[PDB]
Amino acid sequence: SMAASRRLMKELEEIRKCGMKNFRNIQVDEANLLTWQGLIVPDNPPYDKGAFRIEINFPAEYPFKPPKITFKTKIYHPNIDEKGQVCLPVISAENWKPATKTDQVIQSLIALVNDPQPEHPLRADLAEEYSKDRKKFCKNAEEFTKKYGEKRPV
């Protein structure tokens, strides 16, 4: 039918053979390919003791307009706000390239989780803390991950 459906079926068939390392438990209703759920499983401190549920919401015009990512699990990060909104440049409207696939978007998201971008933050308080004293930031983020994060898969 639509370009979104063809393109997202293509992307899913490529992910289902090559499962992604830090994005797991991907759930998509074949009757509504425009919403994906999954579990972000980070590799590095301060986030590597928890996991984070996210939702990817594709517009009907995908791939000609970008998806949006929302964290459902709370996370302590300068570029993710308290409502789970994520500022991810590769999927900003001004940067979006229709050739970009979701695997690259997830890789970009994991790189942001690994290395915050405090120059363009959604939480300026955490961005200051990350820049001035990361060791303190890292301890705060680990505790927040322990207190409010999800259990990691095996």
Residues 6+ apart with CB under 8 A from 41: 22, 23, 24, 51, 152, 153
Q: How far apart are CA 21 and CA 24, in angstroms?
A: 7
Tokens of 37: 């759920």
98 near other proteins, rule: CB under 8 A: yes
89 near other proteins, rule: CB under 8 A: no
Tokens of 90: 């590769």
Only one of the segments 31-39, 47-55, 61-69, 130-138 lies at the binding site for other proteins (rule: CB under 8 A); that segment is 61-69
65 near other proteins, rule: CB under 8 A: yes
**What are the E-state strand segments in the chain?**
23-28, 35-40, 52-57, 68-71
Only one of the segments 1-9, 31-39, 122-130, 146-154 lies at the binding site for other proteins (rule: CB under 8 A); that segment is 1-9
CB of 64 to other proteins, least distance (A): 5
Q: How far apart are CA 16 and CA 26, in angstroms?
A: 9
2 near other proteins, rule: CB under 8 A: yes
Which listed residue (43, 61, 82, 133) binds other proteins by CB under 8 A?
A: 61
Q: How far is CA 128 from the centre of its chain?
A: 22
139 near other proteins, rule: CB under 8 A: no
148 near other proteins, rule: CB under 8 A: no
> Is 18 one of the annotated active-site residues of the chain?
no
Please work out, in degrees rounded to the nearest 5, the angle formed at the alpha carbon of residue 42 by the alpha carbons of 112 and 116.
20
Contacts with other proteins, residue ranges (CB under 8 A): 2-3, 6-7, 10, 61, 63-65, 97-99
Active site residues: 87
